[model samples]
Target: GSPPGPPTSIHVEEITDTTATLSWRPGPDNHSPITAYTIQARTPFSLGWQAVSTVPEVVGGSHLTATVIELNPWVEYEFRVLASNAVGTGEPSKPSKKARTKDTVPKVTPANVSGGGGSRSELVITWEPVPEELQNGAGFGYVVAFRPFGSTGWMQAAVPSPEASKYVFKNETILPFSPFQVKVGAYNNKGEGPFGPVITIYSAEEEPGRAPSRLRAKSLSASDVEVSWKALPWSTSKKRVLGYELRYWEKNEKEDASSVLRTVGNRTLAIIQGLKGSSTYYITVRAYNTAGTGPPSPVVNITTK
Candidate 1:
């Protein structure tokens, strides 16, 4: 009967989200051939170690590595090795250093981080939520941060208690006229996860000031009219107009042509097209900024030639 010496140089490698690989050098056979080697493991918090694998073919040689599976993620476990022959398993080798299983994050990802110009004084940002796996019964919360398009400093946005996908900020908390770059992260009792993808956005115009004044409409042809208006005050309270929405319809049919939409960018004049050659048309215009559409100007009528 032969009793082998304990295995030595115990080594663990390739620790993954669910498994770890362990290996070691053969110890003295005690006389006859060494028949096998055994592996055992236990958590660092406990002194108890249980057998994880046995290399029965240790018959002098073979791959010494054993891949243990089904391990808990982010958990730390220590392992030891032993040798055995016909007589019995030998004394255990020194315990291997402790290693942790790979960390598991929410498989799902936050949907697109999108936003637009909020109130004249705010930025409206919104996103889709990812399915939280809720690690070990503990859950997670969302955190959002932003900065001026080129700034390295990120200012955290005030989030609702717990967490939410949509966040709003008054212009006071945000940089006006400057574009923004945003990133989001999820946190839990364990720790914060990697940041989500970055999103870029710019405030549309702030709501435009009082509706454009001195509106004028002139017939250009059978189906065209030239409409023009004075620019809004260039005051600090008012944001620069981003565009113009031109609306015109038959004077007898509608006062505002909500259906006829023509977008003119930063223009005071718009050419209303696609009208009956001999019909009368009513026209009104609204200026807009990221804030929102501004008040509409007084309606003016035109007779198409």
Candidate 2:
């Protein structure tokens, strides 16, 4: 008897970024049970196909699944299967269907760059539209990484949408005193891509003194209280000592609404007057210079007697 007709009902299923799995039903064999099956794959544009795997006759089954790996992303592939028996090997199955893999690489670029506030304490950054070529024919957002100058490690600062063109790093977390560099990159089904150019800027230490530290608060009377903090080391510039600001706030608020209770020249301690008796409050201190206000000290809480 002759070998059966070409492997019939060939099919492919479950294709992913780097691999594709194929399956098909065994063909009819008039001579002897189909002895074996051979699977092959190749790039859609290639002239030759490479054998993927072969299953021997001992393993009898109507269905077989073959997996192919290390495939290029966003590229199409061709596949086929062959069946063999005691008499002879049957013809190869009609070329297996074609499939494409997802792109694993991210795109590179900073779309929009903007600056806000004055040069004294401003921030600037950029974002990209999406990742590079992907199997799905779409793009993914970007991840922004940043680090201060003289620092050996990079830190993740933000993950903004392709629409958010710029971001500023300011306030207590990112002070103007230290220099910083920022980089942005995108990710998709393929994977993360190379980072974009680094945006570098130096935070000008607008104020002369180091940031205030170790703030303490005590109630001096039912209507008055005193707040103190470690003074920032004075600047060598011999800048005249300016007054200090006592920032206070109520508990459980996102922003501090504390008023400047006192402006004592060259003093790091202040006594707040006209407070409601038995009221609790949070307090922080800040020193100023010709440049601007230095970072506030860590906050301390106290209650008036």
Candidate 3:
């Protein structure tokens, strides 16, 4: 008369409001075909030693799965499995890991899902942890997802441990003329939890994107200097250039009280008047828009004819 070997690798597979499903691997049967298996569950204080299954299911599969019915959801039960034969019941295997009966979806939506710029490409995400009671277990993590504005799919990243509160997107991900969206979700063994608020962050502009290029000045008359320059190739911030400003002064002095400066309304051409005859003047142009003014154009020197 041979008894069955102890079942091994027993664990809580799934838990519902009123029932828990347990699973385990079959143990060796020392030359005697295993007859049936027994499952027992109990809590710390009171468990008159309830049997989850009275009739051991016949051994026909690689693994054994049993649904323990009518268990108190609040008990936080521990379970163990034992193999049996016509001879007698074998020793009980190790107890299964603690199984939580509570529904551990993040207690509520993630909070403080704020975002900020890190650099040209990098961004940072921050949030408060899910409520402790809602965490359900220590074996959970968080998920951070992002996508370029207008992108169809989001790329996701994970925080491996529940203790982490911040994640860094190190790189030159943020850039001017583009926008991004990011959100956070709490996750446990079950899956992703509720998502936090999504935040939109706009990339910052690199210093002046375009400066007036190729400035040219020539004497139109003995008293005037005609000044012209090509508009900057593009706005660094990808914004519209509202207008242009031209400033000129006598070649020998800059920041002089009598310098001539004028605003040219979105025009590429402007004529400078009231200049001293047969004198040289220094002229420069700069482009500007809603964002801000760009670098000054290259300086040009003109002589009154």
Candidate 4:
């Protein structure tokens, strides 16, 4: 005859970012051979033990390993194991043990995130390390999720090093003119923790290179002719210039600077149409880069014939 008893020495180890392996030993089976062992887990926010059905068999010395997946972060959980045989299922193991998984929620406070430059191609972010208890376990690394504003799906960023506090957003995946936000969070066996504070950034539409330097305007045939000294001396090194714009206004009669105009792409010279032939005008020019428009060049004034 077989006897009913509780499972013994149940333990969990090697907790990684997404998965955890649980191992336990079955107690003495008196009436029949102990057929299998069942592991159960429950979170602090839950009422009872949620039976984790997929259990591994004991190879030798009553040891079985079970893997847990798709867990939430920064959650407290209790686990226990039960022994079963042909006679009947034995009582559950002794008092359940308590363990908390790492926080899956990312920290959202702006202070936790840092690093930014005026570069059009890349953005860098860094934050504090995860708590000791959560990261000390079998941790593989953290996950970063981000998406542009008004976008639904989130793109995942993998952090291979568990201790890494920094991440770089590459230009290829992020559009220069797009508005976007990012969140960082930690993960371990238990689950993903809460998300860190969201970092919002707007990508510049203008290209990057030397800005405009000097600008001047004159009148010819009832139209304004505007020209600039050209971009910075070193501007040619950056080959992404798309075009330029010449902005100008009348010299006299102070009101609002209502007269604003833009030149077509690929041209440094601009001839303003529908202007008085014999009027004085003030003007400025700005270079356009791949990202967008650079600073305006020095202003210049000229009288039309």
Candidate 5:
């Protein structure tokens, strides 16, 4: 009794992204009954062959086929079969014809995304590139999705190159001092992959609009007067009012309209001190933002006692 001869006439069938079925003709047994068969696989560049784990180990002489598992996705491979008996293993069969597994969807997405604060109408988005090993298929690119904050509809842009990492969304409707939610995803011939986590970003800043309301000034003491006004609500404008500015000058003022200017925080009230006793002073309040101050409120007069 001896080991069987090597299997012959190797052939491949039922190829997939990660697996394939192989069949071959059984060789002549030297004298002992054939036991299990082994399958070896090789790729184009790596001529070196390795035994692959397979299903339905051909235990009998008549059964001639087995399915190989754990094959790489979207790769070409060649396979061979080896017959074994109680005596020992036999010679390896000739390699099968080259077979390429189908490509699958990308397995990973971009890990990081960023960009904003460039211009009023431009929201630039950029992300890290997906690694080539995880691309899973050919003709890879990215898809960006975004929408205005507090809006239900989303806008999308497709970048056709794997190396492209930036997209600038420009439109007149995109306003300054606004926020947007952005997401990035990868894709290939096999279709779109999952998107990375969402990121929130904002557009460029602009000057505030309109004026502070209900301006009033009164003497708290001979040396001090308190000024107050109403803030501009969100409904009044699309820009952000970062702070307030208070302006004052003596009532019998020169034609220049020049006054002492004081910057106030994002509050509606400010106190002015160091005024001449029994003198009338003119005061006004205005809102300011990143760009600059807006129009001043109506002038008001207060006499220090």
Candidate 6:
């Protein structure tokens, strides 16, 4: 009795990211009945043939199929089958055509996710994209999720390109000095990965509410006058005042565009200069924050000396 001939007609029945089912035909047993078969695999990285473990022992020569397990994801492999008899193991059959494992979902999440310097009605979210290697499969992209702080509802946006690391969310609903929670996640054809840690961010301040009050102006010279007003009380919500906008023009000037505008920083008093001598000027004051200027105070008039 001699060793059986190598198996023949090697082919793959099914393939996945981590396994492949190989099928083959049993060769002649060479007078002594064939005992069992063993599978060998070769990959481009490992030029040498290596024995691969199979599911369900391929015993008895008639067993023509076996599942190769523990295959690397997305790797190309070729396999052959060898038979054995009472004498010794037979030579391996011709290798099967290369089979590539399927792709899997991404395993990595985005890093350093944060909200960009934002403003009322606009929010920009940015993050560090996952490395290409960590994107385990094809169709790599990002999913941005955001919600107003303390709210249960969330909104999501999809970024379809791997090169995009920032997304801009603009709408009237993005209120001034509002807080939002944001997260970034990665995905592929297989599915989505875990989201990054949530980050909290706030929008820029809004226009101050309530204008400067008790506005007064007195003649300091024929061309100059001293102006004063009561600053707005400490504000709440998004209406904190950062400065005051003081405007003045000739009392009979019908066009608002002709007024001179000046900015006073967190102060209630300002001195007007370069006024037309003997002119009666109409003056007004308004508080302003990052968003915009608020409504003006009641207009007042003063005759220059």
- Give candidate 3's TM-score: 0.37
lDDT of 3 by residue, 1-305 (tens): 57888889997778875577778888878777777777887676563555774223443334488777765433477889888876778888889887767544454566777765344445667778764545644467889887779888988899877767777675565564356688888877656677877888544434446788778887888987777777665443355566677777786685454454555355687888887888887777777543346778877788897
Candidate ranking under TM-score, highest first, comes to 1, 5, 6, 3, 2, 4
Clashing pairs in 3: 121-171, 121-172, 121-173, 121-174, 122-171, 209-236
Alpha-carbon RMSD of each model: 11.9, 15.5, 18.7, 14.1, 12.7, 13.8
Candidates in order have lDDT scores of: 0.69, 0.64, 0.69, 0.62, 0.81, 0.82
Better of 1 and 2 by lDDT: 1
**Stretches of model 6 off by over 4 angstroms after superposition:** 1-143, 151-153, 159-176, 183-198, 204-206, 259-265
> Candidate 5 on 94-163: residue-level lDDT in tens?
9998888878998777877987755557788889887665676888889999999999998889998888
TM-score of model 1 vs. true structure: 0.52
Candidate 2 TM-score over all chains jointly: 0.34
Give the alpha carbon lDDT tens digit for every residue of 189-299 in model 1: 566656778888664345666888898999999988888888776734335676666677786675543445646465687778787898987788888765667898998
Please list all clashing residue pairs in model 2, or write none if there are none: 103-135, 103-190, 104-190, 104-191, 107-132, 176-203, 248-258
Better of 4 and 6 by TM-score: 6
Give the backbone clash total of model 2: 7
Q: Name the runs in model 2 displaced over 4 angstroms.
A: 53-62, 106-305
TM-scores for all predictions: 0.52, 0.34, 0.37, 0.34, 0.48, 0.46
Question: Of the candidates numbered 2 and 3, which has the greater lDDT value?
Answer: 3
lDDT of 6 by residue, 86-117 (tens): 88999899999998888888766888887744
Q: Can you write out model 4's per-residue Cα lDDT over 71-182, one digit (the tens) per residue?
A: 5445566677777777877888864466666544333221275544345666556777664434524554677777778889987887867668777677766555556677
lDDT of 2 by residue, 15-128 (tens): 777777777777778768776677777774456888654234233434476666665566677878778888887888887677777665644455443222333554555553
Q: Which candidate should be chosen as best, given TM-score against the real structure? A: 1
Off by over 4 Å in 5: 1-6, 27-34, 43-53, 57-62, 70-74, 84-91, 103-138, 163-179, 201-305
lDDT for 256 (candidate 4): 53
- Which candidate number maximizes lDDT? 6
